[PDB]
Amino acid sequence: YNLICYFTNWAQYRPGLGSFKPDDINPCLCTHLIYAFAGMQNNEITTIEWNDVTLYKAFNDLKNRNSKLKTLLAIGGWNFGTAPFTTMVSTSQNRQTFITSVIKFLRQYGFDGLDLDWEYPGSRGSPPQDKHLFTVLVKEMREAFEQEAIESNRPRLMVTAAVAGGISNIQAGYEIPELSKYLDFIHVMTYDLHGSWEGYTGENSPLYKYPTETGSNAYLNVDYVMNYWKNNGAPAEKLIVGFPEYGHTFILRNPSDNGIGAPTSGDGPAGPYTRQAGFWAYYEICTFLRSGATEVWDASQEVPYAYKANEWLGYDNIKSFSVKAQWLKQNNFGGAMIWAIDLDDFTGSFCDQGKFPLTSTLNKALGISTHHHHHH
């Protein structure tokens, strides 16, 4: 199994114990590290943060401490939107300019591949032709990577993609059978499946549906989404299940109604480190849990929730990570990906569960820190 760990280049700005940079990553926890995010200007890949060049070097230097480790650079993300991708895929000239720039950039800085995180082809302003043009891009990139490996006599750069977990976005965005042939791995965003924007409490990454859910609400769970990808053409071994190391917060409209589906008035309060209303890192969650919150196991969905007065949290913990890891092995998927390693209790000082408690849970469950043949 693989364990793919996203690192974000804005975690460094968080105050105090929240600041996280590549040298804080345990090089043995994951099989692959993915750097989020690069940008694009005039159809060429580029940096975004002022010190990305320095961070790229520290990130790829982690491979000097783990000979099995591979790194990828992710391009795009939610804030980046779709317009640069639409322009880039619109012509063969622009796709070639982009692919050439990617090979050069990955080799320049020491990355082993590119993770495409276009959110999403065919949505958020992207026109309908982008569904097929995304396939064309990926095919052309895979072929260019295959050719560069032979010409340079080196292991091939990998092409992966982070892909939607919502059924409407999946159907508008992806030609699953052909796309899956050319991607090396498919990183499915099986999280953000509920949130305060819906007006009621719900879980971030529930494994199964809640018993009341019918119609399209019955699709909002990890099991349905991963099986949708598999059943519509993606091989199980290329499918990577998304695991969030964060939770979503809500304000309860009625504090006496604190189960699933309780009406809410908006996002919960921003945490002091991540400073984003509606979102808490796992280490911020532990502070909440230890400050008088009531924790409930949502047995139908195999995830915890917690509440305190009018604050409600849908999240994941060691138990839910363990349950979902057991399930992914039972279903022969390729592994797990975490959003994001900088949200784990990397110092160990918030949760009293050791360093990197959520990431370590997946490393142990998926046999990541193991060997087969004796070696030098």
Measure the CA–CA gap between 196 and 219, rounded to whole angstroms.
18
Q: Is 335 assigned to a binding site? A: no
Measure the CA–CA gap between 149 and 142, rounded to whole angstroms.
11
Q: Is 339 assigned to a binding site? A: yes
Q: Is 200 assigned to a binding site? A: no
Q: Is 77 assigned to a binding site? A: yes
Return the number of other C-beta atoms located less than 10 Å from residue 209's C-beta: 17
Q: Is 347 assigned to a binding site? A: no
Q: Is 192 assigned to a binding site? A: yes
Q: Is 50 assigned to a binding site? A: yes
Q: Is 295 a catalytic residue?
A: no
Active-site residue among 44, 119, 151, 295? 119
Q: Which two tokens stand for residue 8?
A: 């974000």
Q: Is 191 assigned to a binding site? A: yes
* Inter-residue contact 216 to 253 (CB < 8 Å): no
CA 200 to chain centre: 24
Q: Which two tokens stand for residue 50?
A: 């002022």
Return the number of other C-beta atoms located less than 10 Å from residue 256's C-beta: 6
Return the number of other C-beta atoms located less than 10 Å from residue 86's C-beta: 18
Measure the CA–CA gap between 230 and 159, rounded to whole angstroms.
19
Q: Is 189 assigned to a binding site? A: yes
Q: Is 210 assigned to a binding site? A: no
Binding residues for chitin: 49-50, 76-79, 120, 189-192, 339
Question: Any idea which residues carry the catalytic annotation?
Answer: 119
Binding residues: 49-50, 76-79, 120, 189-192, 339
